[PDB]
Amino acid sequence: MGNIRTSFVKRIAKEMIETHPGKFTDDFDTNKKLVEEFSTVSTKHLRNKIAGYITRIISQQK
């Protein structure tokens, strides 16, 4: 096996979301704008995974 390496991405997500408590609106558009109003992640297509990640956390949270 090797290293896991994924928790750091989760930390970036936290930093991005937690800067604005507009959380748990369980909509893709909401999380989209939530990401775009902050955005601290490199790689433009990686933003997609971030937006989906938020939505995923939210849907499982409820």
Short mmCIF file of C-alpha atoms in Angstrom, two decimals:
data_model
loop_
_atom_site.label_atom_id
_atom_site.label_comp_id
_atom_site.label_asym_id
_atom_site.label_seq_id
_atom_site.Cartn_x
_atom_site.Cartn_y
_atom_site.Cartn_z
CA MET A 1 0.00 0.00 0.00
CA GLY A 2 0.92 3.67 -0.04
CA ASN A 3 -0.24 6.90 1.58
CA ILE A 4 -3.93 7.77 1.85
CA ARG A 5 -3.74 11.50 1.10
CA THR A 6 -7.22 13.02 0.90
CA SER A 7 -7.88 14.67 4.28
CA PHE A 8 -5.99 17.77 3.12
CA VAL A 9 -8.56 18.31 0.37
CA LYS A 10 -11.26 18.06 3.03
CA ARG A 11 -9.44 20.74 5.03
CA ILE A 12 -9.51 23.09 2.03
CA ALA A 13 -13.24 22.40 1.69
CA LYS A 14 -13.72 23.26 5.37
CA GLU A 15 -11.74 26.49 5.01
CA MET A 16 -13.80 27.40 1.94
CA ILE A 17 -17.20 26.65 3.48
CA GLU A 18 -16.64 27.70 7.09
CA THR A 19 -15.76 31.24 6.01
CA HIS A 20 -19.46 31.75 5.29
CA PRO A 21 -22.11 29.97 7.46
CA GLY A 22 -24.44 29.74 4.45
CA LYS A 23 -24.36 26.00 4.85
CA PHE A 24 -26.89 23.17 4.47
CA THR A 25 -29.10 24.54 1.70
CA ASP A 26 -28.91 21.07 0.08
CA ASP A 27 -28.83 22.53 -3.43
CA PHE A 28 -26.10 22.34 -6.07
CA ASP A 29 -26.50 25.99 -7.08
CA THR A 30 -26.02 27.10 -3.49
CA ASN A 31 -22.80 25.14 -3.01
CA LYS A 32 -21.65 26.34 -6.44
CA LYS A 33 -21.94 30.00 -5.44
CA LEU A 34 -20.56 29.21 -1.98
CA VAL A 35 -17.38 27.96 -3.64
CA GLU A 36 -17.14 30.77 -6.18
CA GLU A 37 -17.54 33.57 -3.63
CA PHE A 38 -14.45 32.30 -1.82
CA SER A 39 -12.33 29.90 -3.93
CA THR A 40 -8.91 29.03 -2.52
CA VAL A 41 -8.36 25.89 -4.58
CA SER A 42 -6.03 25.49 -7.55
CA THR A 43 -6.93 23.58 -10.73
CA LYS A 44 -10.14 24.93 -12.25
CA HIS A 45 -11.80 21.55 -12.89
CA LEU A 46 -11.04 20.54 -9.31
CA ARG A 47 -13.67 23.06 -8.22
CA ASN A 48 -16.25 20.58 -9.54
CA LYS A 49 -15.15 17.98 -7.01
CA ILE A 50 -15.27 20.60 -4.27
CA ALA A 51 -18.83 21.66 -5.14
CA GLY A 52 -19.92 18.03 -5.30
CA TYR A 53 -18.10 17.32 -2.05
CA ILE A 54 -20.08 19.99 -0.18
CA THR A 55 -23.40 18.76 -1.57
CA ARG A 56 -22.37 15.23 -0.55
CA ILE A 57 -21.54 16.24 3.04
CA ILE A 58 -24.83 18.14 3.30
CA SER A 59 -27.04 15.34 1.96
CA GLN A 60 -25.48 12.80 4.34
CA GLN A 61 -25.62 15.24 7.26
CA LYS A 62 -29.41 15.43 7.23
#
